[PDB]
Amino acid sequence: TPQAASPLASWLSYLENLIDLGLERVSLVAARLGVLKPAPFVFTVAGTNGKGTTCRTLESILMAAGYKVGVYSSPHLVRYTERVRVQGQELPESAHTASFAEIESARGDISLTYFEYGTLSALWLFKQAQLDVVILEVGLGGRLDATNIVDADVAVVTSIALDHTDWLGPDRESIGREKAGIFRSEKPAIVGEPEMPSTIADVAQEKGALLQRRGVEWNYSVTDHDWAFSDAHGTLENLPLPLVPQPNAATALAALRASGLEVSENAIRDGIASAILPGRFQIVSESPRVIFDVAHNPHAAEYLTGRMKALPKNGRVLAVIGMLHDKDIAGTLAWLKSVVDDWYCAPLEGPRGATAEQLLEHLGNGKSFDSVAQAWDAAMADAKAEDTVLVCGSFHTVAHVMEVIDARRSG
Numbered sequence: 001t002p003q004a005a006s007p008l009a010s011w012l013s014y015l016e017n018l019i020d021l022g023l024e025r026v027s028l029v030a031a032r033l034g035v036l037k038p039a040p041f042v043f044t045v046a047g048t049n050g051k052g053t054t055c056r057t058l059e060s061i062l063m064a065a066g067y068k069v070g071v072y073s074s075p076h077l078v079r080y081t082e083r084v085r086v087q088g089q090e091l092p093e094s095a096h097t098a099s100f101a102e103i104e105s106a107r108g109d110i111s112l113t114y115f116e117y118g119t120l121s122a123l124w125l126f127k128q129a130q131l132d133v134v135i136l137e138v139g140l141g142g143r144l145d146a147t148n149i150v151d152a153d154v155a156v157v158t159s160i161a162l163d164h165t166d167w168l169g170p171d172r173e174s175i176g177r178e179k180a181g182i183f184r185s186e187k188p189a190i191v192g193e194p195e196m197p198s199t200i201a202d203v204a205q206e207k208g209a210l211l212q213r214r215g216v217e218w219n220y221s222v223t224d225h226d227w228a229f230s231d232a233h234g235t236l237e238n239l240p241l242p243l244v245p246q247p248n249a250a251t252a253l254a255a256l257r258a259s260g261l262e263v264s265e266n267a268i269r270d271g272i273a274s275a276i277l278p279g280r281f282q283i284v285s286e287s288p289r290v291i292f293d294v295a296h297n298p299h300a301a302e303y304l305t306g307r308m309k310a311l312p313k314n315g316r317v318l319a320v321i322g323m324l325h326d327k328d329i330a331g332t333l334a335w336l337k338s339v340v341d342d343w344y345c346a347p348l349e350g351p352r353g354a355t356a357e358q359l360l361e362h363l364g365n366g367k368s369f370d371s372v373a374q375a376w377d378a379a380m381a382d383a384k385a386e387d388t389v390l391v392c393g394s395f396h397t398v399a400h401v402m403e404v405i406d407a408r409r410s411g
């Protein structure tokens with residue numbers, strides 16, 4: 001058993017090597033720790049896709065508005081510490097190991113899972129920091145996610161589509177019911193998904209939550225160079241085109257206006273203008289245009305394909321791909337194949353990672369490589385200045401490339 005002085009790596013290894021579902025055990029330990037209400041105001045964000053960027057937008061705006069903000073996020077690209085941000089920054093590794101020692105002693109003989117530990121740890125780090133606002137990204141689903149032991153002041157649903165069907169149900173209706181579990185009596189329930197499953201309205205009714213959905217209570221319009229927003233409180237014009245998916249920026253703005261937090265129009269403009277997340281349609285360079293997007297399911301791949309198609313009339317689209325078997329590979333590739341010209345396949349290490357050959361079988365074309373790095377090198381060697389190189393398929397794939405680019409800065 002590690003201690004507060006142990007290196008973080010020893011903690012994570014200990015946490016990775018570990019019954020009765022339901023939030024009881026995690027709730028009982030959280031009660032002993034007094035972290036059930038991490039800040040005076042909490043936003044909890046659920047959804048199939050766009051949770052991370054909706055959270056980032058909220059954080060950007062609130063920081064410009066002068067609030068002390070904490071953000072819980074998952075998963076992480078490279079380092080575990082990316083998961084807990086305070087004022088947009090990561091916390092010392094020793095802060096994380098101390099919180100782990102605190103949870104370890106507080107749990108007594110109560111057993112916790114990896115995500116339960118990390119969630120309690122984030123709640124603890126936030127409490128210690130004395131913040132005004134805490135933004136929690138749900139780990140998986142809603143009703144049964146560790147983040148649901150906290151009662152959100154504003155609950156958010158970014159989108160609903162298919163992913164984690166093994167846990168959440170086989171359809172949008174069953175998935176929507178689970179995600180909506182984060183709703184609360186008399187609290188705004190912000191739904192940014194344009195085709196809302198009825199089960200979300202059912203759950204809002206069962207709880208007495210205040211449902212405010214895109215297309216009904218609020219809406220937005222776009223232009224080639226800006227956008228406008230509207231809700232029951234009025235409208236906003238000439239907003240900055242976002243650097244995160246357009247639907248998520250509107251969702252965050254809706255949740256923000258519904259919170260009653262005092263935020264000026266200028267703090268809104270500044271926050272929307274600077275909100276961006278590595279690996280979420282990130283334009284890394286030009287000539288050739290390089291893009292990183294961790295789209296790992298059919299709904300996100302369809303969104304990426306729409307973005308790809310909106311790009312200027314180009315040359316060729318080369319793609320560097322690595323995927324995990326626990327995702328709908330065939331479904332994801334079907335969409336991507338509609339815009340990709342040349343495929344460069346690589347394996348992902350471990351148990352759940354697919355081999356280059358497995359991806360290739362789905363593609364029907366392309367070259368296989370020994371690693372993501374070699375695939376990346378090959379794509380960049382072949383790419384012309386008028387082309388676009390896309391690194392996609394998983395967080396692991398985008399991370400492998402960011403790390404190689406970084407290490408080379410040192411050569």
Ligand SMILES: Nc1ncnc2c1ncn2[C@@H]1O[C@H](COP(=O)(O)OP(=O)(O)O)[C@@H](O)[C@H]1O
Pocket residue numbers: 047048049050051052053054074158159245247248279280281293294295296299300301303304
């Ligand atoms: N509203 C959305 N609709 C469709 N796909 C989306 C949306 N938001 C994000 N995505 C896709 O999901 C990927 C990851 O998004 P992310 O912001 O990390 O959301 P999440 O935290 O729920 O995974 C993006 O890189 C993009 O491919």
Ligand SMILES: [Mg+2]
Pocket residue numbers: 051052073074075137
């Ligand atoms: Mg996420």
Ligand SMILES: [Mg+2]
Pocket residue numbers: 048139140163164
């Ligand atoms: Mg997920």
